[PDB]
Amino acid sequence: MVKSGKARAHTNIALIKYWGKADETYIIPMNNSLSVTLDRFYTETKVTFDPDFTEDCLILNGNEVNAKEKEKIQNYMNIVRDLAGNRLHARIESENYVPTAAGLASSASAYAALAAACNEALSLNLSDTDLSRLARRGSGSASRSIFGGFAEWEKGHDDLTSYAHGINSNGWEKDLSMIFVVINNQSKKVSSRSGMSLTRDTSRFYQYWLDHVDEDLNEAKEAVKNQDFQRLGEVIEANGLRMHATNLGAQPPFTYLVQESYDAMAIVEQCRKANLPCYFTMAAGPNVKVLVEKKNKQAVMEQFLKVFDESKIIASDIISSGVEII
């Protein structure tokens, strides 16, 4: 007989960055992590297990993928096979309703969607905590997409202790919004994974990253507990920039940032001066995310339109709900 599952997971952008791995093989992070989940961007993955298959197949956006991409999905399906009890090979059919490998967190939606589909298919009855544990093995950020609203990846010390949970903001997430500035739509030159790896191993500024990360997290946490937007913005803006500083310290150094990324930051500043409270963060890539309270979405979004082509400004709400079966 043949088992199938289909899930939809939304993406997440980290306010307090995950950048750098303690353990490269289980995906244990060097530091705790805090993100918001977005309902405008998402992955839909269906998985089918068949006695007929002899290796695992990934179909992504309609296309069978390459052979290091294959390799990557193989090692994950292996992890699923050990945990499930069986020997079945799978075929995966996934559509990214979100730009791919481009620094908009297709990793997080991808592997949350998959893990949750695997769960349904193989009838695993996984707790949210174990789900998060599973997605984490595919992609660090994916651990957080099991959940909605604000979520946190607790770094733990091994495979059982490293996972994520949700956080009550008493629905403060409902009054929030995130403007995407889509400067580049295409593949990162360097993948989140390998850039993280090089910065972590070699960066002369990494230690500086680590000495400040936890102080930022508590501050961000106290900000959500009080719903002080200004307080939250200030720390997440600095944290994000500090994350990128670590790349400048790598051997040899590098950056995901382009002139346009800077231009965007400036407009945020002008907005703040013009009395429109907003802050920016950047995943691994040139694109810029702008956190703004729902009230000033239109205004702030307008300010960008004076400078950017409108096929490039994209407002998302923050979703309150976690990953769903479909």
Ligand SMILES: Nc1ncnc2c1ncn2[C@@H]1O[C@H](COP(=O)(O)OP(=O)(O)OP(O)(O)=S)[C@@H](O)[C@H]1O
């Ligand atoms: N729907 C999907 N299913 C399986 N793999 C995917 C899917 N979407 C993207 N990927 C993989 O995700 C990898 C790239 O993701 P990343 O390098 O992490 O960039 P990203 O999309 O911004 O994710 P981050 O790091 O969390 S911002 C690619 O190698 C893809 O193979």
Ligand SMILES: C[C@@](O)(CCOP(=O)(O)OP(=O)(O)O)CC(=O)O
């Ligand atoms: C924290 C990030 O800047 C980087 C995370 O990228 P990944 O989670 O995809 O890395 P891997 O664990 O190797 O898959 C993302 C963000 O939201 O800022």
